[PDB]
Design a protein around this ligand. Structure first.
Ligand code: CLA
Ligand code: CLA
Ligand code: CLA
Ligand code: CLA
Ligand code: CLA
Ligand code: CLA
Ligand code: CLA
Ligand SMILES: CCCCCCCCCCCCCCCC(=O)OC[C@H](COP(=O)(O)OC[C@@H](O)CO)OC(=O)CCCCCCCCCCCCCCC
Ligand SMILES: CC1=C(/C=C/C(C)=C/C=C/C(C)=C/C=C/C=C(C)/C=C/C=C(C)/C=C/C2=C(C)CCCC2(C)C)C(C)(C)CCC1
Ligand SMILES: CCCCCCCCCCCCO[C@@H]1O[C@H](CO)[C@@H](O[C@H]2O[C@H](CO)[C@@H](O)[C@H](O)[C@H]2O)[C@H](O)[C@H]1O
Ligand SMILES: CC1=C(C/C=C(\C)CCC[C@H](C)CCC[C@H](C)CCCC(C)C)C(=O)c2ccccc2C1=O
Ligand code: SF4
Ligand code: SF4
Ligand code: SF4
Lengths: 74, 721, 61, 98, 80, 370
């Protein structure tokens, strides 16, 4: 959803799982067009992976699996 | 070397390190005490001379509720004449917060000539103090048995300095200040100006106070029992005097201050109590109690030999007396702060919010500094004047023998108090950030009501007519009652105690107990410990005993005073922050004609002072807008001093975080560049010593930290109050 | 050498490295450091007198 | 193995700990000509006796600090103090003056 | 334990032996200086590392040097 | 994201730069051979080491006396109500470099802003294909490519030069005195990291080369602090459409306190309040956590060891004398932290509290309005 509109969609870093949240903190962190609590990414990995050609979550998933076997190689 | 330059100023007033014998120090101490009284009299003369020549005091006397007290005028140089702000009365100067004006009006002073002769009169008691310290030292010095005559000193200071001062001020109150203030409270109101020819109409039309003395007919139209004279005093038919000696018991609704007829009966009842107390001690005329005999009588089963040795050290050690007298003057100066905000004793001082905040804060800081000095000179006593033969199985011997029980229990109660006071604040920060306000410690969540303090408040609000029957009102409106308002502003209202007051009171209990822990560990371990068995041989003030035994940095009694000064600073910063927020949120503010109080920060203490975020946002961020926005105005000196004190506090961290072995080696590369060329000195430059670098570091930390709060408090309360 | 000559010191651990000093006394006993040299300025703990071997020393005076 | 009177002392909290029972101990013996008052190295005043004295302390530094007090703080001076290191088996090694 | 080293520049002034609060040091006849005595360190296993000996040494640089080594119960100054 | 990425890589570069000097000093103690390296370039920098350190000391003192003096003078002018008496030096050398790279705002018209200069035409080959795209981007007033700089940018570059030179001065003097000085001539015998050499010879607290690492991390964090404060405030002024607020307030230090620190704290510290919370509540909570960690470091830096060792001795006594708890015995004897360790622990709390305070403030002040 971010590559369709990179100017007004905020990137998502990961989901939040904090059982100590109250219910108004769940709604306060359910942001960036998500219905679960998220962190807005500020590392720039969306802008970097979009420029170098990745477009789908399946693109990043095969990249994630490849760095795991590469780490197992090292 | 340059080390001797600082040791000359550091070893200046350490008189018992100059000379051994006890009688010659006592003459230097007695003479220097005259020299300090003269320094006070020169300072006190400057407050009256600047009160008489550089102020708006009579203009303030005409309009006390709408003119700001000012007594400093700034010369027009460099653009700095902008600090002469318009304080009202056609006067351009610096608004003062010392409360000199409200004290002089309670003294019956009405014009600038009575302030001028008091300035000159203080200036000649400065010279007579400087003569009496020269006469009693350089010519005719006293002797040690006169110095050690503590039964006569306690008689002559109870019935004397305290008795004849409380009685002599009751004479000044009844014959001089009670008429003029009953006169000034009439001219302040529209009616009645009762009565006479002259009736009275001007402030200058009030008679000069020797005419109340010369003419007893002037004294009788206000207080009718002055025609009865001095005669029912000697018959003990005393209820006829209930016109200028009242027990009204509260605040005057006209001025906001204490009833000046109550203060005259206060100083009179203490004069009898002090003079009766001054006939307690046995002297040349046979009868009385003796210090030593009443000390050895109190000797019970739990406590060994009891109070043996207590007479010997309190008559042979100047440091034992100085440590104990600093503990009580500092504790009194703190008690002065609590009793002067809540029972405001001067006319139009209670609605002068820049004065009430400044006087609480000043006497808090003086009290905390002197209590730290009590622990300093108690540790000096243990190093220098403590004697093992004086203390065998007495109270001083037995506290040393269970000092590991005392310190480790004080250690535990400090960790308990820090967890169960500060941890409640960060529990509240976390619950509020979580969106769980029902899980907070608050008045609307999990309540921590101060029920013992609320019960004591109920007894003091139901005292008038009950357990104090002959008193009209309660002792202060702060304990309960209705809102007392001078012209537009609250003087004093009930100060409610909820969950936010429970939390901050246990913060105060925590930060005082840690300061006690640092200073009591410094006293009980000054001579030796399990780490340093000969610590008393190394002195009171030494940096360490080397990097061995793991490292023994800051083991001395001096270094516990050094660490105790930071924790005193931490303790009293929260005390004056508690005062400044609670008064602005729940007490001070403007009164409507309908009778509802609009407080300065609008009641936000109960819901914001329970988190650290609320103290940061609603107290520290919100109220600092007056000091950072003051540039280009009359309060711009507070804006510059806010930044300059931030600088000095940060500058201290260079000394506190570093050590001199770095700085001595950097100076080696500087003296090479000085020897390579030119002027390089003969007095060879050194880094500061380890102790001095700690002393320099704690001095700039305390100066930069306190002056930051000073510029923040004064710029806030002058603009908004 | 002769008592009273000005003396330059050429060892690194000394405070008075390449400093000019005044000799107080010399003894012919056979000890490792026979030359008492006084100095105009104190070291880091106030000595101004250190014994030196003449195998370490330079003089111009 | 060592004789001497224990000084008159009510006890304190600064004395021996578990280390004295399981690792190592120290004793200082000295002979005095007067029944006088001395300061304990662990804090507090005690009464030394005429004749042989015996005091058990935790560290060697506490014993040597007492011996420095026995030298410099009394008229006449007390030089004859002996310091022993006591092991838990009972072996008592004379360590000062070595 | 700590390492206490006495160097050949010792003048035999015995001030380091008087300064030691743990009785680590003693004087040995040496005939390598005018005093004929040199400092020695037999009981270095009792040395705490306080460096009071180095403070008392009047030679420039110090004839006695303390090297803080492996920590024991004795060298850490522990009464427990 | 642009604010976070700059501050991330500048603080990491500051930590890496200080560690370059740290291991340069460890080399001089452990691995350096004055027999092999005999009168080479590395032997020679140690021989005039009092000239390098004293010249770093003069540049640090010259910059600090005149950068702070210019800021305080401007502060007194604005506070007295006369903001035209303040000293505003234009950075004419770096404006000339911008004009020399193709910026037309200052009107110097040298090479690459001169259309007929030798460097712009690239005469014998004319292979200047980049030049049209470069001058299009450098004259667009909407990117961060060679921003307009004024008198507020002059003073803060000289504050940065002060921080670069002082941090180098601590690190160089730590490296060059690592083998010895006059206070401690045999310093290489004691290693890279040791507490002190005792209170003798005047006192030798923080004499090791590790201790000059320790002091320089403070000056590094202050330097990257001044760098990233200036980057953030200049960019926050541009992004808010008010570049004049930086140009008016950055010449005196109250403008930095009020219009940058105080003004942009508003949405951060309202991440939770008595009326509720929003998504900035995690940054508000981290902001206060960073103030707490930073201040906890002051305890390890100001209070030193022998206070704490004597305090732990009463706690060891209390455990052994407490029934039901003296059944539980420690394996390791509780002692206070060492002299070196609490300098490290105090620096670690100071540094962690430094980073996460600013990171919470940088992200929450930028993402609240953007
Ligand atoms: C009745 C009060 C009283 C008296 C008579 C004394 C007297 C003494 N004190 Mg004590 N003491 C006191 C209160 C008092 N003190 C308090 C309140 C504290 C806590 C701070 C202490 C803590 C203390 C310590 C830790 C020590 C003493 C020592 C001494 C002795 C030597 C002082 C000296 O020569 O320094 C000379 C005076 C100075 C060097 C003045 C320095 C003032 C500094 C720089 C702060 C100035 C700030 C100033 C107010 C702000 C203006 C800033 C502006 C100028 C820019 C002397 C017996 C020393 C001692 O050895 O006793 C045997 C010692 O080590 N005192
Ligand atoms: C309590 C201590 C104290 C303090 C802090 C001050 C402070 C001040 N006095 Mg005051 N003064 C004092 C006691 C004090 N005075 C006493 C006891 C007297 C009676 C002798 C005076 C008589 C006096 C006069 C007549 C004047 C001041 C003035 C001043 C102000 C400027 C001083 C100056 O620049 O001289 C510069 C220093 C010298 C000329 C050399 C010394 C300054 C606020 C001046 C003022 O208020 O201007 C509006 C002024 O005209 N003072
Ligand atoms: C209980 C003690 C006490 C109290 C509460 C007061 C209260 C007052 N005094 Mg008074 N006075 C007193 C004793 C006291 N006085 C003494 C000991 C002297 C010096 C001899 C004076 C000399 C004096 C002068 C010259 C003036 C005042 C003024 C005032 C009024 C305002 C300033 C003030 O002092 O704040 C309140 C002070 C405190 C809360 C601290 C009390 C400090 C004393 C030393 C404690 C005494 C110990 C205690 C009584 C012993 C316990 C006895 C027994 C029950 C065990 C206020 C009503 C001023 C005024 O304008 O009146 C309207 C004024 O100009 N007083
Ligand atoms: C302790 C200080 C003090 C001093 C110096 C004075 C002095 C005086 N009082 Mg007294 N007065 C005092 C306290 C004092 N008073 C107190 C504490 C009370 C309350 C008991 C009084 C109640 C009082 C009355 C009722 C009268 C005086 C009067 C006088 C004057 C004449 C006394 C005489 O000649 O016989 C004299 C100026 C008489 C007078 O005429 O004053 C103008 C007078 O009638 N006083
Ligand atoms: C904000 C900074 C800070 C903090 C947190 C501390 C904390 C402490 N100081 Mg220190 N101190 C400080 C600044 C600080 N100080 C500075 C700047 C100096 C230099 C002068 C000192 C010098 C000093 C001295 C001289 C002494 C202390 C003592 C203490 C302890 C007091 C006892 C207590 O309340 O335990 C409870 C602990 C706290 C209240 C800290 C907050 C803990 C929170 C609420 C708990 C949350 C974490 C929890 C355990 C969950 C685990 C998290 C994770 C590990 C999973 C406490 C640990 C004293 C002491 O040791 O007395 C026993 C003592 O004598 N300090
Ligand atoms: C804001 C706090 C602060 C300030 C102002 C300083 C300032 C300085 N540091 Mg320090 N430093 C600090 C915090 C601070 N440090 C901290 C927290 C640490 C970690 C412990 C260090 C660790 C450190 C190291 C390791 C070194 C420095 C050095 C320096 C000097 C750098 C040279 C320079 O810029 O000269 C300009 C001078 C200034 C900026 C200070 C003067 C301020 C004004 C001009 C004084 C005006 C006089 C004043 C009005 C008179 C007083 C009034 C009255 C009481 C008499 C400078 C004095 C270095 C050094 O000394 O090299 C030569 C050095 O090597 N610092
Ligand atoms: C270190 C940096 C620095 C610099 C470059 C300046 C420079 C200046 N300041 Mg500033 N000032 C500074 C720091 C600095 N100040 C600080 C830190 C403060 C706070 C204390 C001030 C507070 C201040 C005020 C209140 C004022 C100035 C003023 C001035 C101007 C005075 C011109 C002059 O000739 O007077 C100096 C006087 C002389 C050189 C006379 C020479 C006399 C001798 C005998 C002759 C020698 C040579 C023959 C000058 C531009 C004035 C101004 O008008 O600002 C524009 C002014 O009113 N300054
Ligand atoms: C409550 C105890 C009380 O008030 O004191 C009672 C007791 C003193 O009892 P005595 O009758 O021995 O007291 C005689 C006193 O006049 C002299 O100390 O003090 C203690 O037990 C020592 C302090 C307890 C400290 C533990 C806390
Ligand atoms: C202490 C020590 C050490 C360390 C060192 C270090 C750490 C240093 C660093 C240093 C550094 C870190 C340096 C840097 C430098 C840089 C530079 C110097 C650069 C250059 C540049 C240039 C020259 C450029 C120019 C240009 C421009 C600007 C534009 C374009 C064109 C050109 C390219 C021309 C060691 C290891 C040896 C060891 C021993 C001791
Ligand atoms: C150094 C001081 C020592 C501080 C020690 C602090 C320990 C922790 C405090 C909790 C102990 C008392 O806590 C007590 O609990 C009850 C039950 O939640 C609170 O009750 C509160 O929450 C309950 C939820 O069920 C509500 O129904 C109730 O209306 C509300 O008042 C009390 O207001 C509080 O007084
Ligand atoms: C900075 C610093 C120094 C260096 C500071 C020093 C050496 C103080 C010296 C500064 C003064 C102001 C130098 C002034 C010299 C003359 C008095 C000036 C003569 C001219 C007058 C007329 C003004 C230490 O010595 C030190 C020691 C221990 C722990 C921390 C530190 C520490 O942090
Ligand atoms: S080592 Fe130093 S103190 Fe000891 S005998 Fe030699 S010179 Fe004297
Ligand atoms: S370091 Fe301390 S214990 Fe060790 S020899 Fe020196 S003085 Fe004795
Ligand atoms: S660091 Fe300083 S105070 Fe601590 S033991 Fe070493 S010399 Fe002493």
């Amino acid at each position: 959803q971010w590559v369709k509109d990179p100017l007004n969609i905020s990137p998502i870093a990961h989901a939040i799982w904090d059982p100590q949240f109250g219910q108004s903190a769940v709604e306060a962190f359910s942001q960036a067009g998500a219905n679960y609590p998220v962190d807005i990414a500020y590392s720039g990995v969306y802008h970097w992976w979009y420029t170098i050609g990745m477009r789908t979550a399946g693109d990043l998933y095969g990249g994630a699996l490849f760095l795991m076997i590469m780490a197992a190689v090292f | 070397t340059t080390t001797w330059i600082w040791d000359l100023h550091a070893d200046a007033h350490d008189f018992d390190s100059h000379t051994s014998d006890l009688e010659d120090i006592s003459r230097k101490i007695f003479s220097a005490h005259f020299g300090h009284l003269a320094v006070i009299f020169i300072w006190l003369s400057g407050m009256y001379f600047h009160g008489a020549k550089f102020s708006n005091y009579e203009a303030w006397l005409s309009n006390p509720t709408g003119i700001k007290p000012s007594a400093q005028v700034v010369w027009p140089i460099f653009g700095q004449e902008i600090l002469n702000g318009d304080v009202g009365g056609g006067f351009h100067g610096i608004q003062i917060t010392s409360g000199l004006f409200q004290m002089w009006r309670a003294n019956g002073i009405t014009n600038s000539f009575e302030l001028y002769c008091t300035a000159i009169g203080a200036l000649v008691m400065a010279g007579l103090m400087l003569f009496a310290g020269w006469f009693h030292y350089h010519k005719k010095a006293p002797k040690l048995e006169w110095f050690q005559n503590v039964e006569s000193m306690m008689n002559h200071h109870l019935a004397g300095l305290l008795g004849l001062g409380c009685l002599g001020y009751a004479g000044q109150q009844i014959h001089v200040s009670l008429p003029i203030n009953a006169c000034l409270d009439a001219i302040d109101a529209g009616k009645p100006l009762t009565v006479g020819g002259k009736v009275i109409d001007s402030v200058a039309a009030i008679p000069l106070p020797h005419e109340w003395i010369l003419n007893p007919s002037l004294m009788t139209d206000i207080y009718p029992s002055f025609a009865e004279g001095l005669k029912p005093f000697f018959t003990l038919n005393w209820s006829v005097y209930a016109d200028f000696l009242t027990f009204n018991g509260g605040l005057n609704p006209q001025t906001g201050g204490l009833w000046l007829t109550d203060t005259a009966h206060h100083h009179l009842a203490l004069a009898v109590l002090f003079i009766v107390a001054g006939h307690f001690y046995r002297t040349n005329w046979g009868i009385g109690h003796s210090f030593k005999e009443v000390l050895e009588a109190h000797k019970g089963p739990v406590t060994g030999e009891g109070h043996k040795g207590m007479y010997e050290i309190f008559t042979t050690s100047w440091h034992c007396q100085l440590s104990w007298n600093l503990a009580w003057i500092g504790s009194l100066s703190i008690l002065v702060a609590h009793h002067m905000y809540s029972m405001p004793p001067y006319p139009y001082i209670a609605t002068d919010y820049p004065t009430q905040l400044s006087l609480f804060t000043h006497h808090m800081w003086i009290g905390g500094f002197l209590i730290v000095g009590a622990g300093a000179h108690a540790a000096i006593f243990m190093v220098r004047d403590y004697d093992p033969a004086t203390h065998i199985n007495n109270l001083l011997d037995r506290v040393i023998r269970h000092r590991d029980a005392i310190i480790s229990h004080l250690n535990w109660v400090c960790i308990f108090l820090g967890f169960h006071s500060f941890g409640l604040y960060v529990h509240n920060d976390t619950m509020r950030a979580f969106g769980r306000p029902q899980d907070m410690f608050s008045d609307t969540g999990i309540q921590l009501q101060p029920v013992f303090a609320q019960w004591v408040q109920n007894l003091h609000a139901a005292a008038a007519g009950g357990t104090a029957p002959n008193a009209a009102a309660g002792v202060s409106p702060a304990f309960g009652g209705d809102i007392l308002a001078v012209v537009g502003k609250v003087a004093m209202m009930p100060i409610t105690l909820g969950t936010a007051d429970f939390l901050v009171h246990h913060i105060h209990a925590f930060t005082i107990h840690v300061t006690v822990l640092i200073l009591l560990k410094g006293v009980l371990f000054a001579r030796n410990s399990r780490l340093i068995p000969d610590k008393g041989e190394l002195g009171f003030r030494f940096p360490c005993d080397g990097p061995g035994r793991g490292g023994t940095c800051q083991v001395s009694g001096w270094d516990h005073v050094f660490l105790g000064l930071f924790w005193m600073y931490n303790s009293l910063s929260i005390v004056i922050f508690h005062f400044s927020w609670k008064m602005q949120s729940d007490v001070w503010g403007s009164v409507s004609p309908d009778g509802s109080v609009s407080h300065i920060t609008a009641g936000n203490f109960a819901q914001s002072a329970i988190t650290i975020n609320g103290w940061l946002r609603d107290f520290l961020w919100a109220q600092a807008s007056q000091v950072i926005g003051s540039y280009g105005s009359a309060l711009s000196a507070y804006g510059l001093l806010f930044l300059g004190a931030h600088f000095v506090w940060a500058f201290s961290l260079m000394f506190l975080f570093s050590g001199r072995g770095y700085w001595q080696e950097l100076i080696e590369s500087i003296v090479w560049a000085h020897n390579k060329l030119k002027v390089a000195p003969a007095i060879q430059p050194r880094a500061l010593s380890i102790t001095q670098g700690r002393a320099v570091g704690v001095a700039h930390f305390l100066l930069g930290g306190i002056a930051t709060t000073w510029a923040f408090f004064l710029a806030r309360i002058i603009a908004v109050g | 050498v002769q008592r009273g000559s000005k003396v330059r010191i050429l060892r690194p651990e000394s405070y008075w490295y390449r400093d000019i000093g005044t000799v107080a006394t010399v003894d012919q006993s056979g000890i490792r450091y026979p030359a008492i040299v006084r100095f105009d300025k104190v070291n880091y703990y106030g000595i101004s007198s250190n014994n030196f071997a003449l195998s370490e020393l330079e003089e111009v005076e | 193995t060592l004789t001497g009177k224990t000084p008159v002392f009510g006890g304190s909290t600064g004395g021996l700990l578990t280390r004295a029972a399981v690792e190592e101990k120290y004793a200082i013996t000295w002979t005095s000509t007067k029944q006088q008052v001395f300061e304990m190295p662990t804090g507090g005043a005690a009464i030394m006796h005429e004749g042989e004295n015996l005091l058990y302390l935790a560290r060697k530094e506490q014993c040597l600090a007492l011996g420095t007090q026995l030298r410099s703080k009394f008229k006449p001076k007390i030089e004859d103090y002996k310091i022993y290191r006591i092991y838990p088996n009972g072996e008592t090694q004379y360590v000062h003056p070595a | 334990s700590h390492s206490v080293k006495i160097y050949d520049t010792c003048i035999g002034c015995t001030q380091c032996v008087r300064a030691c609060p743990l009785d680590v040091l003693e004087m040995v006849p040496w005939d390598g200086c005018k005093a004929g005595s040199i400092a020695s360190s037999p009981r270095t296993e009792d040395c705490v590392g306080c460096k009071r000996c180095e403070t008392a040494c009047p030679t420039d640089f110090l004839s006695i040097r303390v090297y803080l080594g492996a920590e024991t119960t004795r060298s850490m100054g522990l009464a427990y | 994201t642009q604010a976070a990425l700059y501050t991330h890589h500048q603080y990491i570069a500051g930590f890496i730069m200080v560690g370059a000097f740290a291991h340069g000093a460890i080399f001089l103690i452990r691995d350096y051979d004055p027999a092999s390296n005999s009168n080479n370039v590395l032997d020679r920098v140690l021989q005039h080491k009092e000239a390098i350190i004293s010249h770093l000391s003069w540049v640090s003192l010259f910059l600090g006396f005149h950068t702070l003096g210019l800021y305080v003078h401007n502060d007194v002018m604005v506070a007295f109500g006369t903001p035209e008496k303040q000293i505003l030096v234009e950075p004419v050398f770096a404006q000339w470099i911008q004009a020399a790279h193709g910026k037309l705002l200052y009107g110097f018209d040298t090479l690459l802003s001169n259309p007929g200069s030798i460097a712009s035409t690239a005469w014998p080959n004319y292979g200047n294909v980049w030049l049209s795209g470069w001058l299009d981007a450098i004259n667009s007033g909407d990117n961060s490519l060679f921003l307009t700089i004024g008198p507020g940018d002059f003073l803060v570059h000289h504050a940065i030069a002060l921080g670069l030179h002082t941090t180098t001065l601590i690190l160089v003097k730590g490296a060059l005195d690592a083998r010895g000085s006059k206070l401690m001539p045999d310093k290489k015998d004691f290693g890279y990291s040791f507490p002190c050499d005792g209170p003798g010879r005047g006192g030798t607290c923080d004499i090791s080369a590790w201790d000059a690492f320790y002091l320089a991390v403070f000056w590094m964090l202050n330097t990257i602090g001044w760098v990233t404060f200036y980057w953030h405030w200049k960019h926050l002024a541009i992004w808010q459409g008010n570049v004049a607020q930086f140009n008016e307030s950055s010449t005196y230090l109250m403008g930095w306190l009020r219009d940058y620190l105080w003004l942009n704290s508003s949405q951060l510290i309202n991440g939770y309040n008595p009326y509720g919370m929003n998504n900035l509540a995690v940054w508000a909570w981290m902001f206060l956590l960073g103030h707490l960690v930073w201040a906890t470091g002051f305890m390890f830096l100001i209070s030193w060891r022998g206070y704490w060792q004597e305090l732990i001795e009463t706690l060891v006594w209390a455990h052994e004398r407490t029934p039901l708890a003296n059944l539980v015995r420690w394996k390791d004897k509780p002692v206070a932290l060492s002299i070196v360790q609490a300098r490290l622990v105090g620096l670690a709390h100071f540094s962690v509290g430094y980073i996460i305070t600013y990171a919470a403030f940088l992200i929450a002040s930028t993402s609240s309005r953007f």
